[PDB]
Symmetry: D2
């Protein structure tokens, strides 16, 4: 176990049923059961992909003391950094898999993390028994580097959504609507349940852009929301940006398409095809 941070410390604690630069962190794990990296499994849980590399390949690195018999990076790092590390370890005969975790440090404590299993379909079994104690659910990401990839998508979505949710909630407060009422409504719609499993499956994801809710009408409602926010001085940077995305969809002739067609617009914007 390399890394005794907000996630590392409780994860290692659940295993006890070790190296870190902070001697106090070392001391806390010793009083629950190494100066640098004959173990079957190396787990790294470190803040960035540089520290992971410097802990595997640096002066007094893991590689110098590692056996030819899975290294599991559970860190949140750059996917391309993960790909290069898995290849640079595959180059020297060693096996490396990416198993980052979903959910927070509260779930790390209770061993109820979402385990986001990258690496080979075979390789998942080899580490799976060990890591299925540290989380409550495992998702087969379906290849090397797919673990960190689905972690990034999930974290992007949840972190940005928090900012958007804040704008909606303070506009709610500025309009003197109890938040409890907003939440009750939004829990029954895409607002609370998301579009991924509601508006998208039978429309854009099925290649059907025939309208259930038209982009023009969505665009118009966004205008009302931004007028209200601007008269009540609730800054809504995400709302403001989102209206200009809808505006781009209108410019491209998608005005009478279903709102799920925004997905197709962002695909075109990224230089993808239909």
């Amino acid at each position: 176990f390399i890394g005794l941070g907000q996630m590392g410390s409780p994860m290692a604690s659940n295993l006890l049923q070790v190296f870190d630069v902070n001697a106090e962190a070392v001391r806390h794990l010793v009083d629950k059961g190494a100066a640098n990296p004959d173990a079957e499994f190396i787990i790294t849980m470190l803040p960035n992909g540089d520290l992971v590399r410097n802990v595997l390949f640096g002066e007094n690195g893991v590689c110098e003391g590692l056996s030819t018999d899975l290294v599991i990076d559970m860190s949140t790092i750059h996917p391309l950094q993960t790909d290069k590390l898995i290849a640079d370890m595959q180059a020297k005969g060693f096996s490396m898999m990416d198993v980052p975790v979903g959910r927070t440090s509260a779930n790390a404590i209770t061993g109820t993390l979402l385990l986001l299993a990258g690496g080979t379909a075979e390789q998942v079994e080899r580490a799976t028994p060990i890591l299925m104690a540290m989380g409550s659910e495992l998702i087969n990401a379906g290849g090397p580097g797919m673990g960190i990839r689905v972690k990034l998508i999930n974290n992007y979505m949840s972190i940005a959504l928090n900012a958007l949710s804040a704008e909606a909630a303070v506009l709610c407060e500025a309009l003197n609507l109890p938040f409890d009422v907003a939440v009750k409504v939004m829990s029954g719609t895409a607002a609370g349940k998301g579009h991924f499993t509601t508006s998208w499956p039978n429309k854009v994801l099925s290649g059907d852009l025939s309208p259930a809710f038209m982009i023009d009408l969505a665009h118009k409602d966004l205008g009302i929301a931004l007028d209200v926010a601007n008269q009540l001085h609730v800054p809504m940077p995400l709302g403001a940006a989102s209206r200009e995305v809808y505006s781009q969809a209108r410019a491209a002739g998608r005005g009478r398409q279903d709102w799920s067609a925004i997905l197709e617009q962002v695909r075109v914007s990224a230089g993808m095809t239909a």
Copy 2:
């Protein structure tokens, strides 16, 4: 009961159709005569204008595209006001500006008339099957009076808890879902650009705040309880957002909402919230809007 229905559009037409199916007597108006004709086939009496539609109706329903057309249908040349009785109840089910709704409810309360806001959640497919989400504003008395009529058009009613609270919860819901659609698109195209099957992303996000939202997950026992002690620190959220935007920018997936959201997290860091729970972003947006800190 005797109902006037003005606005026979994608929503209006099947809503009015469900009222007739439930044995109500409808006077219908809309500028499109074909829309009028579809409801007349189904038993509605046609009216030449809003005034005629409103004559001796207990309930006046408007379903129109904006608050100006609602005003011009209530107060304009041959308006609802000209044919309305002081005993009737006006239900605007339109999505319009909440402050336009407040002014219309007051300008109808000024002339002895009763007006309530009952906008709807869900689409035209649900209007057809009478399974709309009914977002009932107006007084508890007005909601009780109107509920029997409303339950012919929708399968669920939510008491929004006052005049104008119906349109407000509609606006908050629609703001959230319309903007979220744009954010969801950024996540899905970054997913595709990284060659991750989308079904895998959705499976993962369905188990976290990404798919379940923050309102009922990260918020209740943290910021909404006045506890800002970190479960997930703003600085770490800020860092992960940076990685996402670096990747998107290397793969040329434009993420305007992500990019804006990082500058919100940056503002939270500048204000000393870096070691607070990510739910503290709510407190940052409240301060940013000139509200008193909780």
Copy 3:
């Protein structure tokens, strides 16, 4: 000349005052100048009776319509020989509709909104942004030069409001961008005066309109002087630094996603002036180059 003036606000009041000072005869109305020689009127209609020129200076295009076409409106008192001058800053499409709805009833209407502040309204040194026909601008110029010091022929009906909006959009948004650059400057402990000296030698301080654009994108030449890929990369460095120093840069952040869209569309090796072409395509216009 015989003038009706409707709207005696922060701008209206001193503008009408300068018209009287220049020996014009004013009928004035406002919902809330007589000391200074104006005849008061009970409503727009009365104000308009036997006026050659009707001036409106109101906060929005709805109040302009309700003052021209409403109960006791200007149309009620206007002659077919008179000229309506809306000097209000309102929606351009609202101006177009008002000029047409007045041309429909035999009345003549031009847009002459004003640039510069209420200090300039007081001294009669406003920037006059003269829309309307060449004839209407000639006819109105003598009246207008009593309220402003400089007149710009916008070159048609509705072009007055349009050039006001474009100018004000550009300057108001630029203020926000300039702020981001200046605070990042301070966060890096670079004296501002040094940054300004440097930026005065580049498009940063001189702008792109008259520097990098004329001989590149505006000439249909997209061959690089400065490549979009490198511009995109520099924006990345700026946002990383700002994010480490907690200087929020919402305009920078948005701008990088615009450059990112230009890269997605295959413009990475084009000149940075090609961003104009990208925004034209984004707005559903036909590509020029």
Copy 4:
């Protein structure tokens, strides 16, 4: 003088060409052998790698796309450090991350070598004519030593006032100019969508802060003098921005920078700045960045 020049791109090539024209001896390296060949025709000595280029050079110039390629050219396999003397002066004229520059200047100061940052303002058109703006970081001694070499590539030099201050003022300049290009595009396309000739817009904007900028017009005697009394009120600026965004949204001209800018003005209004001069936006962005109000 004996100069090593590594990076013969859109900037590098003509800069090195101007050094040869001024009778300096250049050892040139680039991964593109055709770029090497163009400067060899003009009198340059080709080198197989950075090391060879650096052997017995008084001045080492790097002009590369990013700070990683600069490091790999200075410290990599057959790097500049392998052929560099303790007597030479390394001048990175690249646009890279300021912290990457600080680390490179320190990692070269650690091995007895001298390194300074002299990035350039203006484009490759100015590189060709030797009229670059030279943004001289490093010590005043290093700037004096390098100035005669530098003045062959640029027409003016600005003493940025220390190591790493060259790249810092380059970043401020480049941030401003790159983002301004995006904003200028929004204004010009809204202009076209409204069927207003651009030349008319430019004539007007040339007489205001739109064309002249705020730094030297609206800011000096207001916010930069500590005076926030209005010439143009934030509320009025906020209103005009709203009209522009309504028009753009009706004509489907996407204006992401405009839309973001209005939310900045909105934050200024929430903070009580509505009746302050528009120059007070500077003070709002300072507060947003956690700086003390001036």
